[PDB]
Write an enzyme that holds these catalytic residues in place. Sequence first.
Site, mmCIF file in Angstrom:
data_model
loop_
_atom_site.group_PDB
_atom_site.id
_atom_site.type_symbol
_atom_site.label_atom_id
_atom_site.label_comp_id
_atom_site.label_asym_id
_atom_site.label_seq_id
_atom_site.Cartn_x
_atom_site.Cartn_y
_atom_site.Cartn_z
ATOM 1 C CE1 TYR A 148 1.322 -3.270 -8.384
ATOM 2 C CE2 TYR A 148 2.733 -1.392 -8.916
ATOM 3 C CZ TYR A 148 1.565 -2.117 -9.113
ATOM 4 O OH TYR A 148 0.649 -1.700 -10.047
ATOM 5 N N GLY A 164 0.839 -1.184 0.000
ATOM 6 C CA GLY A 164 0.000 0.000 0.000
ATOM 7 C C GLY A 164 0.878 1.240 0.000
ATOM 8 N NE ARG A 165 -2.038 6.517 -1.183
ATOM 9 C CZ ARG A 165 -2.151 7.318 -0.127
ATOM 10 N NH1 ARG A 165 -1.066 7.796 0.470
ATOM 11 N NH2 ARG A 165 -3.353 7.681 0.308
ATOM 12 C CD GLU A 173 4.738 7.213 -0.713
ATOM 13 O OE1 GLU A 173 5.642 7.509 -1.522
ATOM 14 O OE2 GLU A 173 3.557 7.591 -0.852
ATOM 15 C CB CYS A 195 2.648 -5.128 -2.619
ATOM 16 S SG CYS A 195 1.755 -4.158 -3.873
ATOM 17 C CG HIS A 196 4.203 -0.088 -3.149
ATOM 18 N ND1 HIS A 196 3.175 -0.582 -3.923
ATOM 19 C CD2 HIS A 196 4.751 0.929 -3.856
ATOM 20 C CE1 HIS A 196 3.104 0.107 -5.049
ATOM 21 N NE2 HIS A 196 4.050 1.030 -5.033
#
Lengths: 388, 386, 387
Positions: free
Chosen positions: C331, C281-282, C285, C311-312
């Site tokens: 990802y 997800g976000r 980051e 993923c991320h």
Amino acid sequence: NSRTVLILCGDYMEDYEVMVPFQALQAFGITVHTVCPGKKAGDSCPTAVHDFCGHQTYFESRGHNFTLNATFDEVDLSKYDGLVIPGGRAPEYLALTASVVELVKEFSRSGKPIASICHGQLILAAADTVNGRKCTAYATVGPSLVAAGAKWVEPITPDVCVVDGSLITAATYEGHPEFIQLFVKALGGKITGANKRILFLCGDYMEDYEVKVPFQSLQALGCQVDAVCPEKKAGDRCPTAIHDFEGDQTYSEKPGHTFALTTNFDDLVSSSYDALVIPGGRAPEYLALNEHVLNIVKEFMNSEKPVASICHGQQILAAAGVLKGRKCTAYPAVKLNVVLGGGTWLEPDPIDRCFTDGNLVTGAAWPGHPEFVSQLMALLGIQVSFHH
Amino acid sequence: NSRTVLILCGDYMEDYEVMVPFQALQAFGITVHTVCPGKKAGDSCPTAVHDFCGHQTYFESRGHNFTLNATFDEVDLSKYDGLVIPGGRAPEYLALTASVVELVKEFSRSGKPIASICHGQLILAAADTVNGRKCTAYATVGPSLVAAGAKWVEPITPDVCVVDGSLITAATYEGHPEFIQLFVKALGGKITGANKRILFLCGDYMEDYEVKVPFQSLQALGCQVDAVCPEKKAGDRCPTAIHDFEGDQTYSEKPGHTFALTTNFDDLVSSSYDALVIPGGRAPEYLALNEHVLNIVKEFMNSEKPVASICHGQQILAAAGVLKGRKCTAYPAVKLNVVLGGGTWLEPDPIDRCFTDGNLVTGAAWPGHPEFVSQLMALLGIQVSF
Amino acid sequence: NSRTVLILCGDYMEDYEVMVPFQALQAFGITVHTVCPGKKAGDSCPTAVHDFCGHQTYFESRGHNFTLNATFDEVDLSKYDGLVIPGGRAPEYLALTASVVELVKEFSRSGKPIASICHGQLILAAADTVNGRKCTAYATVGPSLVAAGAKWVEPITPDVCVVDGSLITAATYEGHPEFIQLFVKALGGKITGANKRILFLCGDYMEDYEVKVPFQSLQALGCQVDAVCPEKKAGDRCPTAIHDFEGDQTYSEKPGHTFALTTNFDDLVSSSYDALVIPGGRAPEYLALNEHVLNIVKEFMNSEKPVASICHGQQILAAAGVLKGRKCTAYPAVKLNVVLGGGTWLEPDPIDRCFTDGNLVTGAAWPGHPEFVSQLMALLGIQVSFH
């Protein structure tokens, strides 16, 4: 006119980060082309609204759909003087697109100016064009840039901009003013007559683009721009509305970015400003009821100071009775208000066309920001000349 | 019968402002046609939900898609006894549509009743039909009306209504009751037997139309209508759900308008009420678990007082055990609750039909409001005559 | 193979209630097929996100579109050992679908295990298969079940589960752990080595599925699982993001369920945990910029304890500099971060494939949860066997 810039677009690129430079640069006399890999001129790209509400990171919702005016596959880099790379969520996937990294590498190789913002720098990292280069970016992009050999500059504040040769980088759309100014200068542009003070009459649900684009475009030139709203003070935020045409007989509406005011409506000396700007959206209809707001409009109109109103903004002018014997345009529907106000209607066709009547500059909708800002600049005597 | 009314619709007209009068007038026995320039019967218009969160102005989200039942191009004004103009964002663009301005101008000069609400009045200003006429409208429309020569009545309260000859106006959907009542009277209608007190069992996420339409339709007749929700007091609000079919095997759900309760649930006394109404949506499933709510239902049913339940509202009746040996309809899926509850099922075909079994009126979904309200009116001895 | 389960799907079924069992059961070595009347394998169903946000009842928004992998009209019940009935708003209409009622009645009659959750039980009532059976369900379904002859168990808390022979029931997705465990046992399954503590590195806007599926899958096995987020304490919540591909060049994003943290990040002793999981997800980051978060990652990597990132999530690993000379996937877009990080890229093809490199397990996107959880189970020494 004498300069042509290319904007590297993608799906879910940040709405402000593509539209502000797209319209600001055009307002300054620069021809701007927008492309997205796999898409042709006329095609659209969804955009993302990245707002800094109060969470540990930004929130996202959809912005205006953005219509491209150029075809990626037909791009001739020799025809472009500069490149702009918007942020948002498009960079992460654009950075993995072979043709995109190729394009950026070719442009970086030429030494031509590249203005990259927020997450846009991920593409520069993928193109391996930041080795030993000083640059900033959205904070989360720091690790990748450092890994790519960049001389990373942590953005201490959201408006931070960094320059390395012709490479201009910013961290967020809050740095648009200096970001765009540096890019213009990089293109050989010289700005004159920008020592002006501009007042923006804002309110809840004003149109997202209509407040941000003109506001930041004028700040990019070097103008001091203040934003006020009744009952609200500096620091407070106004929610905005994104108006877009999606197939129905009238526009749709959804939330845009919250916009922060800069000055207190109470402590406001209209004689201290050189021009007035009125964003459109749904704020004008209620601001038009505020006697204090009408007084400010009458003052500027009487002092014959430049007044720029767009789309529904004209509802305030009509209520102020300052449209009698004046020629102007507005959002199509607002023709009722203009005519009822005793003004002469000017057909907004194309929709991006703007008109100047003495000290009054009027636009019909956000597509007309280039001429809106350009015509306001003319009245203020602000010029951007590409002679350097 | 006896009267036929035209509603000037448009994309993004306010959802309540078109649906409440559309269904209320039909419930009262009036034939209503809905049209939008450039569209034909069967076409749909997106609607806007405008809620006032006490902010400097309203917030907008999307409402139910509205299906037109008439074709603008085939309209013959001579057939219509009255005209209704909903508010929202449709008026601003409709006001610049030549065909619409002509229609309104002609209708106005005919002297027939025009009921315009909130922003709808922008069309009247464009048609230049308010000069010297007393009228109100949403506050922000005042300048346009004043410029058009109107004798402007500032809307001091959300429910403010004005009637001046053939012109009836309101400022917001909160004025729907008197707005519709004045329009009905202008059409030569006489409302009798409306001196009744009705109770609405509300809850969080009840269906947007299902609480507002019946509630305001009954208020328009002149009834005193109270809305309660357990654990909440007068002034508190309940979020609502907008249920619409958009192509999938079952309906979609998105936010509707927040609905304000008018009475405290704890002080409630059933003996004071003439009838009970239960809106559908997702409130009934949890309200059916509240013994106080079940007790209220049992009292009304035992007193054989009119009880009107629509769509999922019947889940409460089923849990109360009052459907045993009774006949009724409900949202199709709720047939399960009805049958398990001991009731006999009546198929809602068409979906907008309602049934009455003694003191029990039941509907299946929001399209059924006209018959839902008209059948409740019948039990209450309320009639609208022309 | 060994065991095959059928999941009765429908439009607007609850997103967690279909995806968690679908992926957890597969992670445990069970073949799972999903069907919806009127639809074929490959078709999709919209899902509902039911969140409890302080109102008198749940709030709903739209979740991920769910892709079916089986065709309802071709179902051969003799091929299935168990049946799962997700909740949401699908049950109310599925319960009135003759073909569905016929299917459930036959399966119940066969005596095979049926795991029904939340509103799913409405179908059992319609199929008249609960008379004399002890069961719970979402509270509002109680009246119908009682009317149907059930020995109703009002759920005192959202995590309540009940088992009566071949009938396993739960009230809400909060009961997924015990719900799934009981169902696995009903299928003749045995779990071993699950006495482990797992730590989840959460954050605002982490992907809705990527936190909930692995988290509850591990809890279903019997593991003690905790979730933390910087600047937040147990009880606080993090909004989540639903990432789906709806036709554009990259994924769309909308709100998912809010996720509750279970332990205070500020008072955390990561060394007390056996494994670390990093949802995508976000969130990664920005979490990758937190030295405290990086320190947790470095600690697990240095100690060579199992670390599963998807993923991320790998952005955190890259920032911590622990990908040097390691093999992993992520990802697709995150390949940039991985390569710049010094790691050897492993192509995520198919997208649901996961890879293990020593103590590191990596996935690329939510479709990979089955292998993601399965490979983490291997490193942890957790097995699920069937007689």
